[PDB]
């Protein structure tokens, strides 16, 4: 709808008309980029991928690509419906179906973060492959199971899954079922600027002995592009949720965070795929 | 039957040789005849594989030169090498013109598109000696830079560094003899770690 | 002055032994198989996919009966394979890791293995004890041991990098034959059906036909103008194709001592790594460096068919005894079967 | 040095001069003759039904 009350309280009645279209397309636009994504990481299986690195990373760019999908086509139709034609029909399990793919979405981020974060910290340090898939896909799957369980188990009964006409995840002196979206999800995206971070301390490291200085400054435009790929696939635009949880009042942080993340799809396919040259050089041709 | 279980069996034993094997390093070693290449393997036919192990990091050097053959029908069997350890006499002038040529050829090679260079400058000690006994513009027709010695040794620098024309894809670096064995293994450990990273980071796409 | 004299015999000398081999050449094999049909799309599935190696395959050898295989990688051991169901039959750890040639014994006995080491480590699969141990360390080569073949259970043939072949007697372990007179590496070698005379390729686009019994060359063909990486005579024993650099298979005719054809493509730029021959040497097999093998026939130089399937370069092909599969082993550590 | 090298050579060319060649016609209808000889027992050229194809 806002897209803004997943993390916020409510939504300014003043800035929601104005934001429903950019949401609206920003959505379709999105939908679009990972059929793309989708559709050449298909044609692309198995084929361009030779080490357990390049492996892991392209299992967890699928992994986030398909919860992305899923859950923003589960997000429209669960926004699509109205409140009072099936209270209980079709919007309790779009709006559980649509929090638990939110959630893995955010572990999957979160694990493609700690793989990053333990590749760089430790360097000479091999993991049973199939072990470390099955590691990933039980932690980024069933810990959003079981909070999604729990969840629907613990407000159900008292009829506060969801208030009046919005029948996403309430708050505002009802129940506390939404902190299991704002508590984990930023945090994981914390998780996500503290590695990025890290990635930083290890792309200006002081160089190794007395060798003269190679560039001038032409590194800067590595680190540049390094930062806009590794931006949008470990989800730090997620962080202005904060901000709606800071004041709810403004419409900048809600419009900004809506821009950003309704777009987020098209950033993923620009820089995570795009941008790759290993992709670019068979795609130019094709 | 028993033919499957020896067929596990050796499965077994390959895969626990290929788990012992994933923490080598496995490295390479150049250079020219008496350019110090004995100083930086002795610190602890054809080809030689010296193994030596710091901070529990096992390293295999191959001192490739003894083969005296065609290097282009057996360089391709070299790859998977995290760097190539290069040595070079500073003092010996004679051996820079084929010790660069060797570099400059080796570098340019479609094998080595992306292996890094941790070449050395061996010789440092009795190169300061010979520039005062022989002046260094002498010897060389180019701008041999100022007359202090860590000038020259920049220039040598500077005339190694852009004979490498994969200057994006190649990280190369640049250190002089050190009497520690210790500084010298310290700084292999480091040039190697810091090129595990880097091919982490460029496999993660990152780069 | 004096050398000028032996320049100009040697240089009449070639004139004269071109201008008999133009006489000789009244016309070329593939006018004369314009009447014979052609062998058509010929359709080629790997029927077994040999994995565990966990280095670049580099040479490879087939067993006398047509079931046993044996496969030698960067790795640093050597793999013997059931074929039929694809079990692993003995893995010997080799002390050198590089090893670029290998042989299996035509009475199954022992495995012959060479590398940059130098040097040729025989091993004897069959042994009292039962662990495989090192029956012998032929050294005496100053270069890379490029090829080695077994002519029987006590004698093998050596190529080594310096441009040498080398007829070794196994229980001796010193050079019984050297021949020389090769101005480039010799980088690989077959042996004819009867055992009696081999060619091999060398560096310098020229293949040498040498008679084990005697020692001497007997003859000389030079129709390439690259490395020779593929040597492999015809199953009559009269002909054999080379594989250059330039993915360009040329017959040669012992008798003949002429070129017969060239198979080569437009479409195919890379060299040649190995080639091989049918059980009726009609179809004719090689491997390029273009990730995939081709399948041509070898009376009309046309492409029969493509064994795409390798993630790498493939490295050695080999067809059976019996002619009822041929192996293929590429850069990726992968085995196929093709059939 | 080279001056052994060169008489070795030509020695070996004068050795390899005085070798019969037969006509290539000769040759190619023998080859001929080989490969419709053993054409039946190409399993690659004609393909081998699975019932006695070990590796089918
Ligand atoms: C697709 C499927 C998948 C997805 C993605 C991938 C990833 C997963 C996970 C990873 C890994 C994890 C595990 C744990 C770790 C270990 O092991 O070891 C420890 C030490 O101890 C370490 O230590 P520290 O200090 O802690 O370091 C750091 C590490 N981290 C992880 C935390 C980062
Ligand atoms: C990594 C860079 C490029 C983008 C960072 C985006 C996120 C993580 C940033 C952008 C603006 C930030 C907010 C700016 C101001 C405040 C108010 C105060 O209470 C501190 C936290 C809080 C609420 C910040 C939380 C983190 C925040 C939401």
């Given at each position: 709808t806002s897209f803004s009350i997943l993390m916020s309280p409510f939504v300014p009645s003043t800035i929601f008309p104005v934001v429903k279209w950019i949401t609206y397309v920003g959505l379709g636009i999105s939908i679009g980029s990972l059929i793309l994504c989708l559709i050449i990481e298909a044609l692309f299986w198995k084929q361009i991928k030779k080490s357990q690195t390049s492996h892991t990373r392209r299992i967890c760019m699928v992994?986030?690509?398909?919860?992305?999908?899923?859950?923003?086509?589960?997000?429209?139709?669960?926004?699509?419906?109205?409140?009072?034609?099936?209270?209980?029909?079709?919007?309790?399990?779009?709006?559980?179906?649509?929090?638990?793919?939110?959630?893995?979405?955010?572990?999957?981020?979160?694990?493609?973060?700690?793989?990053?974060?333990?590749?760089?910290?430790?360097?000479?340090?091999?993991?049973?492959?199939?072990?470390?898939?099955?590691?990933?896909?039980?932690?980024?799957?069933?810990?959003?199971?079981?909070?999604?369980?729990?969840t629907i188990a613990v407000t159900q009964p008292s009829n506060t899954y969801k208030r009046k006409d919005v029948c996403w995840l309430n708050w505002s002196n009802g129940s506390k079922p939404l902190l299991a979206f704002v508590v984990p999800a930023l945090a994981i995206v914390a998780v996500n600027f503290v590695v990025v971070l890290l990635v930083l301390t290890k792309l200006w490291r002081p160089t190794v002995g007395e060798r003269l200085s190679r560039d001038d400054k032409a590194t800067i435009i590595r680190v540049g592009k390094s930062l806009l790929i590794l931006t949008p696939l470990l989800g730090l635009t997620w962080g202005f949720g904060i901000g709606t949880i800071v004041d709810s009042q403004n419409l900048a942080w809600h419009v900004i965070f809506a821009l950003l993340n309704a777009f987020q799809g098209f950033f993923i396919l620009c820089f995570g795929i795009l941008l790759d040259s290993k992709l670019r050089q068979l795609l130019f041709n094709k | 039957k028993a033919a499957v279980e020896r067929s596990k069996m050796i499965d077994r034993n390959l895969r626990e040789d290929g788990e012992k094997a994933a923490r080598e390093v496995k490295l390479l070693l150049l250079g020219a005849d008496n350019s110090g290449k004995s100083t930086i393997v002795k610190q602890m036919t054809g080809i030689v594989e010296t193994h030596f192990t710091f901070k529990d990091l096992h390293f295999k050097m191959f001192d490739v030169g003894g083969q005296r053959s065609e290097r282009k029908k057996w360089i391709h069997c070299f790859e998977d090498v995290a760097a190539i350890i290069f040595c070079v006499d500073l003092s010996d002038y004679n051996r820079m013109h084929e010790s660069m040529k060797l570099f400059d050829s080796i570098c340019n090679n479609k094998w080595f598109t992306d292996t890094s260079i941790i070449l050395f400058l061996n010789k440092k000690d009795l190169f300061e000696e010979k520039i005062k006994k022989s002046p260094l513009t002498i010897c060389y027709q180019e701008y041999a830079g100022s007359n202090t010695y860590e000038e020259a040794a920049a220039y040598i620098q500077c005339q190694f560094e852009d004979l490498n024309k994969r200057k994006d894809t190649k990280e190369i670096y640049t250190h002089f003899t050190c009497a520690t064995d210790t500084k010298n293994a310290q700084f292999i450990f480091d040039a190697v770690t810091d090129v595990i990273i880097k091919n982490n980071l460029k496999d993660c796409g990152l780069f | 002055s004096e050398l000028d004299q032996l320049r100009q015999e040697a240089e009449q000398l070639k004139n004269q032994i071109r201008d008999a081999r133009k006489a000789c050449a009244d016309a070329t094999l593939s006018q004369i198989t314009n009447n014979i049909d052609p062998v058509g799309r010929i359709q080629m599935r790997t029927r077994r996919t040999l994995r565990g190696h966990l280095a670049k395959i580099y040479a490879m050898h087939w067993g006398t009966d047509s079931r046993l295989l044996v496969s030698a990688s960067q790795d640093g051991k050597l793999i013997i394979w059931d074929s039929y169901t694809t079990n692993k039959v003995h893995a010997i750890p080799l002390r050198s890791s590089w090893v670029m040639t290998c042989a299996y014994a035509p009475s199954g006995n022992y495995v012959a293995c060479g590398g940059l080491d130098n040097i040729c480590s025989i091993y004897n699969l069959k042994t009292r004890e039962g662990n495989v141990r090192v029956s012998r360390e032929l050294a005496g080569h100053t270069g890379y041991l490029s090829c080695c073949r077994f002519l029987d259970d006590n004698q093998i043939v050596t190529s080594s990098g310096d441009t040498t072949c080398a007829l070794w007697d196994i229980e001796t372990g010193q050079q019984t034959?050297?021949?020389?007179?090769?101005?480039?590496?010799?980088?690989?070698?077959?042996?004819?059906?009867?055992?009696?005379?081999?060619?091999?390729?060398?560096?310098?686009?020229?293949?040498?036909?040498?008679?084990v019994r005697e020692g001497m060359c007997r003859q000389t063909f030079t129709g390439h103008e690259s490395d020779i990486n593929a040597i492999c005579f015809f199953p009559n024993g009269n002909a054999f194709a080379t594989g250059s650099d330039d993915a360009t298979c040329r017959l040669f005719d012992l008798r003949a001592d002429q070129e017969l054809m060239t198979y080569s493509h437009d479409n195919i730029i890379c060299g040649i790594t190995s080639v091989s021959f049918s059980k009726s040497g009609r179809l004719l097999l090689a491997g390029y460096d273009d990730f995939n093998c081709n399948v041509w026939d070898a009376l009309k130089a046309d492409r029969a068919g493509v064994l795409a399937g390798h993630d790498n370069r493939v490295s050695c092909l080999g067809v059976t005894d019996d002619g009822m599969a041929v192996a293929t082993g590429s850069w990726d550590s992968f085995l196929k079967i093709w059939n | 040095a080279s001056i052994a090298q060169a008489r070795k050579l030509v020695e070996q060319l004068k050795m390899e001069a005085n070798i019969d060649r037969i006509k290539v016609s000769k040759a190619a209808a023998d080859l001929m003759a080989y490969c419709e000889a053993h054409a039946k027992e190409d399993p690659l050229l004609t393909p081998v039904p699975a019932s006695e194809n070990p590796f089918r």
């Open positions: 992994n986030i690509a398909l919860s992305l999908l899923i859950a923003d086509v589960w997000f429209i139709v669960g926004a699509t419906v109205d409140t009072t034609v099936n209270p209980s029909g079709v919007c309790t399990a779009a709006v559980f179906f649509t929090h638990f793919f939110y959630l893995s979405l955010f572990f999957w981020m979160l694990m493609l973060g700690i793989l990053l974060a333990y590749r760089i910290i430790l360097v000479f340090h091999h993991m049973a492959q199939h072990l470390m898939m099955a590691v990933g896909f039980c932690l980024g799957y069933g810990c959003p199971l079981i909070i999604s369980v729990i | - | 034959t050297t021949f020389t007179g090769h101005t480039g590496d010799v980088m690989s070698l077959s042996l004819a059906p009867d055992t009696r005379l081999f060619v091999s390729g060398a560096c310098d686009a020229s293949a040498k036909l040498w008679d | -």
